[PDB]
Amino acid sequence: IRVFAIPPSFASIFLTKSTKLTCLVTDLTTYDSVTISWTRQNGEAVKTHTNISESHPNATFSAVGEASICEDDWNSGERFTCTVTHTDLPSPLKQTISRPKGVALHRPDVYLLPPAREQLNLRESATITCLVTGFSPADVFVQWMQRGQPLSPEKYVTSAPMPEPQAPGRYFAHSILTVSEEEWNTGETYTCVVAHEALPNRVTERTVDKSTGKPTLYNVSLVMS
Amino acid sequence: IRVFAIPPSFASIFLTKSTKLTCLVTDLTTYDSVTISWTRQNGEAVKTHTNISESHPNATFSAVGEASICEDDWNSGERFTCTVTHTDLPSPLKQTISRPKGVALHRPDVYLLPPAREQLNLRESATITCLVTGFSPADVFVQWMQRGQPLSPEKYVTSAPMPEPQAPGRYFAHSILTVSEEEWNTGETYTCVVAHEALPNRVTERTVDKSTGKPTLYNVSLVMS
Amino acid sequence: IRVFAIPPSFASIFLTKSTKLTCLVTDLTTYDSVTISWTRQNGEAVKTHTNISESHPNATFSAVGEASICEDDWNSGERFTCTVTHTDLPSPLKQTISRPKGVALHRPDVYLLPPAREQLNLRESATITCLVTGFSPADVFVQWMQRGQPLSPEKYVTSAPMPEPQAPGRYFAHSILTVSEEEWNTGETYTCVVAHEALPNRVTERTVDKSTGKPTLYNVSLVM
Amino acid sequence: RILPEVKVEGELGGSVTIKCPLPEMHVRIYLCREMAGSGTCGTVVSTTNFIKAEYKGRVTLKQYPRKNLFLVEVTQLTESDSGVYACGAGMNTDRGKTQKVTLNVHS
Amino acid sequence: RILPEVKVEGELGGSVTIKCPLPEMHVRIYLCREMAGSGTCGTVVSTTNFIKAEYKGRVTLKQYPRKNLFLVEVTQLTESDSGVYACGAGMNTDRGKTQKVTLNVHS
Ligand SMILES: *[C@@H]1O[C@H](CO)[C@@H](O)[C@H](O)[C@H]1NC(C)=O
């Protein structure tokens, strides 16, 4: 009887560039001949979804309906309603979802932080941390590119947006990339790229290597017979 | 009916230096003088479940039955049960919990990363981050000690334990302390203290200061020869 | 029959994380079927004494009884009693143990002195000294952590506390650990860890290494 | 290098308004108060929600695109000697300052 | 650098209980009289039981959480050269000196 609405996540909109909104019809009694569609504010039908879901292991019905739509229509602030029909429902289910807008957008401010020299003594693993602070809403994507090409999602780890202690409504996140010792010693650069709506160009990035912090070292050597 | 349990956690065992275990009954009818209590493995009665709370004002029931058994048994392996009987369910229900025995041990290695120079350039707010990594048991308790006596929990934020990218079963964790900028320039210890049960003394401290990452700039090797 | 009770001590309770209060007896005539019982203020059941001691060399028997409690009970003022009953007494003996309340607390600041330059000329062994001073009461227990793992308790020595010379109630205590210069000059860290009640976490520590007194800006190392 | 010196008498009930150039659009405009001991400048309020601890609840900001004027308004003044307050913009603080103003509080 | 100035007058036992801020934060608190000859500061009264040798019995301290105040009172004044006394907190002294005062003992 329930219809959750899975919005297109900015991680998915940015990773795939093919934004699709899902109509997760959950907890119906299992019956056949189920059609799920979508309409925008004007109420007209959309393309039929693929990948029909199976019945839930909880002896109930779980279905997914995804529609690929133009991104400007999704960000226009329109109302998008999934239309669900069934045999046990006296009336079709009319699931309305839109932007949870009305939030003060703040651009993320990335700050890279390199491994401490105490870590760089075992010569086992360096952990570069891409601390992201002062951003709203609670949505952000972080990738790690080296020499211009990205890296596997299994090498770096990203946390979840926790609320900031001294700033309500503003979140922060973390991200760790674990390299081996020698690559960071060769000075090979690493790039942390952050995608978020409030960014002026929707994408920012920062760079780091061995020689970021290293100042000038006047090694003098007096001598007078 | 809902009978859930809160077994003691390592942080809870640590800060109070005592062990408290509770079980909660939820979604019962709004009825007073219910029967919720705790008992031991042998069936011995425990200290009274004092401080009973009021029902949840959404027509549900909210009351917790607690018990104070010292740590000498929690590390032995004797699972506990709490008796729950009520007008809805007259049969005394038992809620069985025990510590998760059968987990490896790994020393939680700890580092401090000072704020990036970009933070200081804003003259706005530093964010010292205590990183803990490579510990097998999930739970770990991290707090911040300034000048040797504690700080309020609303000035630092601790991330939940997360699985490691490359390590098989170990975990990592972050803590951030958002100090005032000018105070870090003055310089304080800001000791990050971590408590975890794989440590020898179960306590480890690290500390950093403004004059901690400063490198030498003059290798004035003067030789007379 | 003379009773002799050893209450739990902070070092003992903390090193093994297991509280254990004990009472033995001397002057007890050598005879079997000795009776050692333990009771609380409420006088409930206890753990039965195990591995009873044998007779003393001077033709008298030794009976020892220990018990395990919850640690907060010892700090709650509970005066646990042990009753010693045998067949050589006119009246059964008992001895009651309570924590010495009324004592002040003072945080032991831990200072770590590196070995002297004179000692680092003979080139056989340096001696790092950990100086636990200005604390109250006296029951500290130090240990030397060497890069994560502990060290054997025969490589360092601690001393019983003495009253402070100028401070009335403040005590102090020493500790030494011996190394050899060929590793001390290498620069690996040595740490002194101190456990005492007055500490905000009951554990504090300090670190030292050979490159500690250096000013870390420049390292004017004139050669020949 | 400009020194648009503006002053006031300043007591406790008096409120002080400081005019800063609006840099236009949005670029982290802030008001910074020079730290005499450090010899450098220290932020008191910026575009972000940061407000200095002793100045909590005592400082407010008003941007005027119609006049391109940035008003820093302090409702209650007291012993806080009006040393130097600099209007500034951009991420870095010391690079982004202009109006190096100072004003007395007593008379 | 915040600095008050309590200048006194009693040539005998006419003391004065200097008022110092409380961090309320349970760190060591102290008063430190600057050593003119050395050019640095020297502790006289601290949270610990220390009292300066010439000031034994003549100086006491009171903490007021109700008023958040730290009163250092000297019952008898030897009319000696009264330098600058700084209230402070923390382990290190010269870091912790918050406020500094100087008061004449004679008139
Ligand atoms: C510093 O100078 C010493 C002088 O002997 C030399 O051995 C060492 O290599 C120098 N270090 C660097 C980093 O140049």
From Swiss-Prot, chains A, B:
Indicate which residues are glycosylated according to the record: 51, 58
Effect recorded for residue 186 to A: Has little effect on IgM BCR assembly
Q: What is the effect of changing residue 143 to A?
A: Has no effect on IgM BCR assembly
All copies of domain Ig-like, residue ranges: 8-98, 108-209
- Stretch list, region CH3: 1-102
Residues covered by region (CH4) = 103-212
Disulfide bonds listed in the record: 23-82, 130-192
Q: How is it modified after translation?
A: N-glycosylated; important for IgM secretion and its localization at the plasma membrane. The interaction with FCMR is glycan-independent.
Q: Which superkingdom heads the taxonomic lineage of this protein's source?
A: Eukaryota
Q: How does it assemble?
A: The basic structural unit of both sIgM and mIgM molecules consists of two identical heavy chains and two identical light chains; disulfide-linked. N-terminal variable regions of the heavy and light chains form the antigen binding sites, whereas the C-terminal constant regions of the heavy chains interact with immune receptors to mediate effector functions.
Q: Which disease is it linked to?
A: Agammaglobulinemia 1, autosomal recessive: A primary immunodeficiency characterized by profoundly low or absent serum antibodies and low or absent circulating B cells due to an early block of B-cell development. Affected individuals develop severe infections in the first years of life.
Q: What does this protein do?
A: Constant region of immunoglobulin heavy chains. Immunoglobulins, also known as antibodies, are membrane-bound or secreted glycoproteins produced by B lymphocytes. In the recognition phase of humoral immunity, the membrane-bound immunoglobulins serve as receptors which, upon binding of a specific antigen, trigger the clonal expansion and differentiation of B lymphocytes into immunoglobulins-secreting plasma cells. Secreted immunoglobulins mediate the effector phase of humoral immunity, which results in the elimination of bound antigens.
* Protein name in UniProt: Immunoglobulin heavy constant mu
Q: What is the organism field in this record?
A: Homo sapiens
Q: Which taxonomic lineage does the organism of this UniProt entry have? A: Eukaryota, Metazoa, Chordata, Craniata, Vertebrata
Give the stretch of the parent protein shown, with its full length.
222 to 433 of 474
Curated annotation (Swiss-Prot), chains D, E:
Give me the ranges of the annotated region CDR4: 16-98
Location of this chain's protein in the cell: Cell membrane; Early endosome membrane; Golgi apparatus, trans-Golgi network membrane; Lysosome membrane
Q: Which cysteine-cysteine pairs are annotated as disulfide bonds in the entry?
A: 20-87, 32-41
State the residue spans of region: CDR2.
42-53
Induction / repression: Regulated by circulating IgM levels and immune cell activation signaling. Down-regulated in activated T cells, effector memory and central memory T cells, as well as in activated NK cells. Transcriptionally down-regulated upon TLR9 signaling. Down-regulated in response to IL7 and IL15. Down-regulated in old age.
Give the result of residue 28 to A, as annotated: Completely abolishes interaction with IgM resulting in impaired IgM internalization
Consequence of changing residue 92 to A: Displays reduced interaction with IgM
Region (CDR1) location: 23-28
Q: Note what the entry says on domains.
A: The Ig-like V-set domain comprises three loops analogous to the complementarity-determining regions (CDR) of Ig variable domains, which are responsible for engaging IgM. Mediates multivalent interactions with the CH4 domains of pentameric IgM, facilitating receptor clustering and signaling.
| Role summary | High-affinity Fc receptor for immunoglobulin M (IgM), both secreted and membrane-bound IgM. Primarily regulates IgM transport and homeostasis. In lymphoid cells, enables exocytosis of membrane-bound IgM on the plasma membrane as well as endocytosis of IgM-antigen complexes toward lysosomes for degradation. In mucosal epithelium, mediates retrotranscytosis of antigen-IgM complexes across mucosal M cells toward antigen-presenting cells in mucosal lymphoid tissues.
| Protein name according to UniProt | Immunoglobulin mu Fc receptor
Q: In which organism is this protein found? A: Homo sapiens (Human)
